[PDB]
Design a protein around this ligand. Sequence first.
Ligand SMILES: CCCCCCCCCCCCCCCCCC(=O)OC[C@H](COP(=O)([O-])OCC(O)COP(=O)([O-])OC[C@@H](COC(=O)CCCCCCCCCCCCCCCCC)OC(=O)CCCCCCCCCCCCCCCCC)OC(=O)CCCCCCCCCCCCCCCCC
Ligand SMILES: CCCCCCCCCCCCCCCCCC(=O)OC[C@H](COP(=O)([O-])OCC(O)COP(=O)([O-])OC[C@@H](COC(=O)CCCCCCCCCCCCCCCCC)OC(=O)CCCCCCCCCCCCCCCCC)OC(=O)CCCCCCCCCCCCCCCCC
Ligand SMILES: CCCCCCCCCCCCCCCCCC(=O)OC[C@H](COP(=O)([O-])OCC(O)COP(=O)([O-])OC[C@@H](COC(=O)CCCCCCCCCCCCCCCCC)OC(=O)CCCCCCCCCCCCCCCCC)OC(=O)CCCCCCCCCCCCCCCCC
Ligand SMILES: CCCCCCCCCCCCCCCCCC(=O)OC[C@H](COP(=O)([O-])OCC(O)COP(=O)([O-])OC[C@@H](COC(=O)CCCCCCCCCCCCCCCCC)OC(=O)CCCCCCCCCCCCCCCCC)OC(=O)CCCCCCCCCCCCCCCCC
Ligand SMILES: CCCCCCCCCCCCCCCCCC(=O)OC[C@H](COP(=O)([O-])OCC[N+](C)(C)C)OC(=O)CCCCCCCCCCCCCCCCC
Ligand SMILES: COC1=C(OC)C(=O)C(C/C=C(\C)CC/C=C(\C)CC/C=C(/C)CC/C=C(\C)CC/C=C(/C)CC/C=C(\C)CC/C=C(\C)CCC=C(C)C)=C(C)C1=O
Ligand code: HEM
Ligand code: HEM
Lengths: 426, 327, 171, 53, 30, 129, 129, 76
Amino acid sequence: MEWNKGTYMSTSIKKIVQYFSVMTVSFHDINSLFGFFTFLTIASQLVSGTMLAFSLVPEPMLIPMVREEEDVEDLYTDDFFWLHERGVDMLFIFSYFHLFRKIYLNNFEYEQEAAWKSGVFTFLLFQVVVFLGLVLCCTHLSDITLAIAANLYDTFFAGKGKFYWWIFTSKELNTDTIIRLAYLHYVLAFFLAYLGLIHGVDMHYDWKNESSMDGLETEMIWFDEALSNELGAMIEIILIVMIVCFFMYPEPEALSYEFFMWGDIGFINDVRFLSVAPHWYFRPFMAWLTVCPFHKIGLFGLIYYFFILFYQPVIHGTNEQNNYTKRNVAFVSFFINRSDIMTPKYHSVEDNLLHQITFWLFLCSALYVTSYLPYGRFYNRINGNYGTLWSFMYIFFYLGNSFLRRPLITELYLFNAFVKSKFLKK
Amino acid sequence: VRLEKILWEQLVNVKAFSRQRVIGAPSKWYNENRTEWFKVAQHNAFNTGFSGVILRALEPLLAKFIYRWRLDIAHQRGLTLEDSLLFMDRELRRCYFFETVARQNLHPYTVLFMKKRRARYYKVERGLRGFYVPDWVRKEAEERQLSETVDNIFNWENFVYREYMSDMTPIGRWTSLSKITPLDMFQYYGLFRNEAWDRFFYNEAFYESYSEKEKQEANGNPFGKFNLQTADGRAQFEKEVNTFIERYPFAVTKPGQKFDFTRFYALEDLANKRDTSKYDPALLESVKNELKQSAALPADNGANKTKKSKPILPDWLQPKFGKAFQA
Amino acid sequence: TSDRQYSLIHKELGNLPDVTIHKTHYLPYSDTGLFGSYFYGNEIFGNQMLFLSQMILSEYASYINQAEIYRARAKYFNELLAEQNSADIASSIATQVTYLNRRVPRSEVAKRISSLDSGLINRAATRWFWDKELAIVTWGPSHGLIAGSHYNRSIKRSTLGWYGNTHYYIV
Amino acid sequence: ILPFKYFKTKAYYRNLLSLRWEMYAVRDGVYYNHFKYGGYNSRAYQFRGYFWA
Amino acid sequence: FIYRDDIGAFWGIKGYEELVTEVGTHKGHN
Amino acid sequence: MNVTGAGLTHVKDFHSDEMRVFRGGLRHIADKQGNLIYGSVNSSVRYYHDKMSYERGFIQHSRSPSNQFINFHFMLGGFRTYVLERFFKQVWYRRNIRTFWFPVLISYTSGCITMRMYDNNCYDYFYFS
Amino acid sequence: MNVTGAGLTHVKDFHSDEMRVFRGGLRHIADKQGNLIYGSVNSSVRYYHDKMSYERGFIQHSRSPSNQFINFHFMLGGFRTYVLERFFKQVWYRRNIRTFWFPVLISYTSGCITMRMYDNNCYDYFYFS
Amino acid sequence: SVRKAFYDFIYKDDKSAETYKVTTADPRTPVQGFRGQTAEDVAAKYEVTKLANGVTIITESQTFPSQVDMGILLDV
Ligand SMILES: CCCCCCCCCCCCCCCCCC(=O)OC[C@H](COP(=O)([O-])OCC(O)COP(=O)([O-])OC[C@@H](COC(=O)CCCCCCCCCCCCCCCCC)OC(=O)CCCCCCCCCCCCCCCCC)OC(=O)CCCCCCCCCCCCCCCCC
Ligand SMILES: CCCCCCCCCCCCCCCCCC(=O)OC[C@H](COP(=O)([O-])OCC(O)COP(=O)([O-])OC[C@@H](COC(=O)CCCCCCCCCCCCCCCCC)OC(=O)CCCCCCCCCCCCCCCCC)OC(=O)CCCCCCCCCCCCCCCCC
Ligand SMILES: CCCCCCCCCCCCCCCCCC(=O)OC[C@H](COP(=O)([O-])OCC(O)COP(=O)([O-])OC[C@@H](COC(=O)CCCCCCCCCCCCCCCCC)OC(=O)CCCCCCCCCCCCCCCCC)OC(=O)CCCCCCCCCCCCCCCCC
Ligand SMILES: CCCCCCCCCCCCCCCCCC(=O)OC[C@H](COP(=O)([O-])OCC(O)COP(=O)([O-])OC[C@@H](COC(=O)CCCCCCCCCCCCCCCCC)OC(=O)CCCCCCCCCCCCCCCCC)OC(=O)CCCCCCCCCCCCCCCCC
Ligand SMILES: CCCCCCCCCCCCCCCCCC(=O)OC[C@H](COP(=O)([O-])OCC[N+](C)(C)C)OC(=O)CCCCCCCCCCCCCCCCC
Ligand SMILES: COC1=C(OC)C(=O)C(C/C=C(\C)CC/C=C(\C)CC/C=C(/C)CC/C=C(\C)CC/C=C(/C)CC/C=C(\C)CC/C=C(\C)CCC=C(C)C)=C(C)C1=O
Ligand code: HEM
Ligand code: HEM
């Protein structure tokens, strides 16, 4: 393998210890600490999941009874289960906030490539693990999730020759499927730790809390000066989350989304398809499937979202040609009388207003997409929510199209002002 | 297989459709300067056609939300547009091409001052947020007009093109990162690039370019087609320049003063073949002196020099004072 | 960079700082002949010089770029037009007469070599270079090369193309 | 615990930024050759043979 | 973002529209 | 030729002391001899922090925190200046809200309106008369 | 002193071309420049073959296996000489059996004797008269 | 053509190809359907002309058709 030149860092215990004992971190704010929160939540997820594994027997017909009985006879088991669920929630929250923050700072440059992609891959893997975890609940929610995943897997093969059997045996949750998925969940959850370590090592090459290049050269020593601040910011965000959850969720509630988790596989055969809803983090994808009734187009939308999320630095980056790359433009060619356009250069973050407007439109579209369930019972018979379609289409356009990111208007206007001023002053 | 002579090329790139490949004298890759391309494109988009008409109507909004916004933020930070436009913070922080070019060509101060100006603000903003730069720093920030920042920007971009970007030959490439991830593993660079397929040889003639007419037109009067000789043209030109100065406070003059049009007309007359004595000799002398100084590259006087060090070993590292007849 | 050229072997040689001299010798005789490559360079690149010559040649049995074909074509044309000294031309005439009883003119040689094509090049290379035996000599510090100093699998598969470049790339 | 976190982190960072900087005019014969010929990039192996050639 | 309060879905949770579900929690406090 | 560079080129060569135990005779090489190979990550992990930085005639002064305020520049002035005017107008609005108030407001209003229209269609579906 | 060695010692110093892209101008460094650092495992894995070997005036000849017997020297003599004598008397006995026939025989005899004693005591336990 | 593409895809000779016949002819005999003209050397004629700016160009006619050589000399 001569094509592979090498590795940025050799993750040996000696060198890792030295690197983390000599690491320096520049002064930062809370917005640039979501990565540490994600990593700490990953560590707690590892610990709590290890504790849970010693209680969960992978037989589907015993998981509900085992969970119910081992919460009483054993102390702290239900505490660890609650910690695991809330850790998944906070892990999704921190990961998406980190993604939004890194999209905001325009980290699609070439020097960020290794930092960016290594992160996205981790995120991608972090998705798969979550899916497997859901299956372990052995509720009707797990049944529906497994069925949808099996249908998506079988989509690639045109429904020929049961290529899904090695994992989704019969497309149903049984002893074999549960055992295999639980073991894969454990192994990939532990692999996520190594992936996160690799990403954290890579990203330190060019780390910035803000886009503006502060001239400071002195930096904090990571072990305690930065670590204490990271832990404190984690504490503050956890306090805020506790307050919001305490007030937004009354102790007894009516019509929660957990009501679909009543049905346990095996015990209850009939499924209340009227109220089918996943956890909020997988809510956007189920909403997309409901909005796009076409199976192939929905699968393509999911794959495109994830992969374009992976390939941001390539579409929007400098591309090593130093902004001499030529785009393909539909209509601007007529206005400029040129087939192609040189990539614009001045695309700062804090200063320009177009970038902020587009980014916040994208973020609000994502929030609206996760805001509710389209309720496919008559979501199409009734003309569907136009806001959901607008938000999905803007998400697709923002990720992939370079006219909403690095727009040409700013560069042309700045050059016009430059030309006018130089002509006036010669 | 050869990309040229492929069935598609044989059927399409034929003299009948005028799509044939034409072979000429060898020429460098990246034949077109980016600064000139953007100048011509900006002129075409703003001062011609329906696009020009639309963009002229948007001058107020663009000036408010794209120029005065950046200027206000920079002044709040004790900076100017230069600090954000001459060298982007991306290049200033982490960019190996910029680092190498600066090391090989630039004097250290040209970037040291850029870094220290931001250090001034961010030594306080990080310590305590919400920092508003005091008036004395804001004054020196406001002193420099955009008319010199544009000169610096054009000089830097033209130098980078003529010296480095004009001596580069891109090639087909695999993933730069030696990452084991399969998604990064099989990244293919070279296809989906317009330049890659537009010309398969370094001898091919260039098929898309700006006509000489457009290049010459883009060097005229940015504000519009006027006639500074006739009084009617001068009135409209002065009106447009005044509204421009109003829209852009620190572009050509301080936001409280007015532009001296007589000096501008004298400069135009001196630069071109048109000449006359309608201006005072003092005005002509001042204009010539200003023109000479503006185009004069600063040089070192070799005066007021500090002392160079010639260190010597301390006393304890040297032999003692005494020295007697050895034998 | 070494990648920016049309000679495949020169790319590799430029990548190696200390591999200094390389020349391809074609010595034909009445009954037999030897066609090969002689490298001279620092012993640290021993294997690199050992497995390089074959790797390129055998690779031409599977694929050769038209750029190399035209480069060699032009070089041969120029060398044909570069025979000017009387001694060299007289010696060439005498040798050609001895081995063929005929003086091969410039035009005939140009027509012969120019008619070569990528397919013909591949067929000739596979006839003469692909998966063929070798005569190898190494003179000088052989501390690195003693381990593989015998005619073994590594040498056997060197005359293959993309299969056998394992040892060249390492180091 | 919030106030003690504040003392540990934010006040401490503000204290560390209480730095006095001074720049002088060095005009001795020495040339800035270290700047012209210097610098190391940890990701140089990813840029060698791939970029700006 | 704003969910109508007479559809029969509490806070936007669709389904359970053939039931009386808001009694004691949202309408009335047992 | 029998020269190190073959007599026609110069080779930047160096015999690393790694893999060698003795300088000569029976004395070990210095433990940190390998660090004398500048610009190599293998030499030290400190080379990862390698951003461009060059300076001459630069002096900076720092003071021990023991001699500095535990909480410096806290509540200077009143609540109005330190909190209402600085942390809210200059830190929350000037930096954050001033950037996203318009896009967020537009998206929020549009989502509210679209959800209301969707709910009204749902009502029409469920309720007649 | 301002010199690199401080005027007291000579420092074996080297500026590794690693962590650099261009040796001059925009020209790139040689792809395998780092291999010029001799005596470093990091340079190449081949350095792990670190056996001691020095020789002069030595010439070695090795022939292609394509001009050699597929199974050379097999049954070159009679079956008795190649197998019964060479293998069962000079490879098995002379090497293996001649070295452990005595200790293994003694151990086997002692173990058999003691196991027989153990079985005899067991029989005495189980059976009476 | 189709035949050339096929015989290139599988690395086999195309006997009927004219190029193959030309490239696999007996070295002791002339090529079947090609023959180059005979030419005789001519004397060398030198000509020097100065341009308006001051650049001076020297030229020599071809004694026998061969490769063109060009050069720029500077008193620097
Ligand atoms: C937790 C409990 C379970 C533990 C299981 C442990 C493994 C068991 C099998 C192997 C046992 C021998 C181990 C020898 C290791 C020698 C190498 C070494 O230590 O180098 C340091 C190595 C890093 O090497 P590197 O050169 O730095 O390259 C990475 C760079 O950072 C570059 O970074 P980057 O960003 O460019 O790349 C990102 C990422 C991108 O990677 C990917 O996307 C690829 C997916 C991950 C790898 C998938 C491997 C699948 C193997 C299936 C095996 C089936 C079972 C049968 C096993 C027996 C043999 C058949 O790259 C990687 O992660 C590549 C590193 C691969 C690590 C695993 C190496 C061992 C397995 C290799 C194959 C088998 C060897 C057997 C040898 C002995 C003979 C039996 O670090 C580790 O080994 C990390 C260990 C983490 C352990 C946590 C749990 C993960 C377990 C492995 C992954 C399982 C994924 C799920 C599989 C599901 C299948 C259905
Ligand atoms: C959306 C929601 C709404 C919005 C939410 C907004 C959220 C906002 C979050 C804001 C977070 C950041 C806050 C920052 C505050 C900054 C304050 C400041 O300026 O300090 C600078 C100031 C010095 O700054 P400087 O600029 O260097 O001074 C310049 C001076 O000119 C010269 O300075 P110096 O050299 O004179 O001073 C050196 C310094 C250096 O001294 C030290 O470092 C020694 C520190 C010793 C701490 C000992 C802790 C003991 C804790 C347990 C106590 C017993 C508990 C019993 C409970 C049951 C009672 C029945 O010594 C002192 O200053 C001595 C003063 C302390 C006297 C001794 C008492 C200490 C503990 C007091 C708190 C505990 C009270 C318990 C309850 C009492 C009954 C109500 O720092 C301090 O002195 C800090 C002292 C420690 C304060 C801890 C406060 C904790 C309070 C917890 C209890 C809360 C109330 C009760 C609750 C009950 C129910 C649970
Ligand atoms: C009680 C009364 C009893 C009375 C009777 C007593 C009888 C006493 C008998 C005593 C026997 C003594 C034997 C002494 C052995 C000495 C060996 C020796 O010294 O070797 C070196 C000896 C001499 O070589 P050297 O040392 O270079 O000396 C130079 C010589 O002067 C000159 O060298 P050379 O190059 O001239 O060597 C000539 C040599 C050859 O030497 C060579 O150059 C090597 C050539 C190797 C060719 C191997 C065969 C290639 C084809 C394989 C099949 C491909 C199928 C593909 C199908 C595709 C379908 C899509 O001659 C051959 O051509 C023999 C090759 C025989 C190969 C047989 C392998 C199995 C074929 C199975 C075919 C199945 C077809 C299925 C069709 C489809 C059905 C659905 O070399 C060989 O003998 C090489 C060949 C060895 C073949 C061994 C085959 C063993 C088979 C299994 C054991 C036999 C019993 C099996 C029973 C099965 C029951 C179920
Ligand atoms: C109950 C069930 C069955 C249990 C079976 C248990 C087996 C135990 C074996 C113990 C010995 C293992 C030694 C391994 C190597 C370490 C030693 C070593 O290398 O020493 C250096 C020593 C000297 O070597 P060196 O100086 O380095 O020179 C290089 C050699 O020439 C390099 O040698 P080479 O490459 O030329 O030779 C390769 C070697 C290849 O041999 C192997 O090691 C290969 C073995 C393959 C099979 C191994 C596994 C078999 C497992 C079967 C049971 C499985 C159960 C579980 C099944 C699944 C679950 C239920 O072939 C030979 O040399 C064979 C020579 C011996 C043939 C017999 C000649 C004597 C006949 C007359 C005496 C008969 C017995 C007398 C008993 C006592 C009363 C006098 O090496 C040898 O010569 C030893 C050769 C290997 C051992 C030969 C067999 C000796 C057995 C003696 C056992 C006595 C125990 C006490 C009495 C028991 C009464 C019942
Ligand atoms: C799902 C339906 C799909 C439609 C059906 C299509 C099926 C056909 C599948 C073709 C792809 C698989 C590759 C097989 C051939 C690859 C040959 C190759 O790599 O050659 C170059 C490679 C080059 O590799 P190399 O470099 O190792 O070779 C060098 C060897 N020397 C130096 C000696 C020359 O090997 C060859 O040169 C082999 C040439 C033989 C060509 C064999 C062609 C077989 C025909 C394949 C299918 C034809 C179409 C009909 C299919 C029926 C469909 C209805
Ligand atoms: C495609 O199909 C596939 C899958 O499914 C889809 C897969 O999952 C997989 C991968 C998965 C597997 C092969 C299954 C692996 C399962 C795993 C890793 C799940 C378990 C994960 C864990 C983290 C378990 C952790 C367990 C513990 C902490 C238990 C601790 C218990 C003990 C006893 C610890 C103390 C003891 C020791 C350390 C032993 C030391 C010795 C002693 C104490 C001696 C004592 C005795 C004496 C006399 C002193 C593959 C490859 C696959 O192909
Ligand atoms: C980042 C790491 C991990 C993530 C993101 C993750 C994700 C999840 C999720 C989403 C669930 C379902 C929660 C729910 O439906 O409410 C789950 C359940 C579960 N996980 Fe994980 N997990 C991780 C690590 C682990 C590890 C390391 C183990 C074991 C070593 C583990 C074991 C389990 C078990 C046993 C369950 C089911 C418990 C039960 O049903 O009572 N998890 N996980
Ligand atoms: C479980 C998933 C992830 C973990 C554990 C993780 C971890 C981290 C950590 C600890 C940091 C340093 C602290 C910080 O920059 O805030 C970081 C930075 C970074 N992350 Fe991630 N991250 C994850 C997901 C992602 C995603 C989804 C992306 C992009 C799509 C990404 C891209 C980056 C980048 C570019 C940086 C460096 C930022 C900079 O240079 O300023 N990461 N990551």
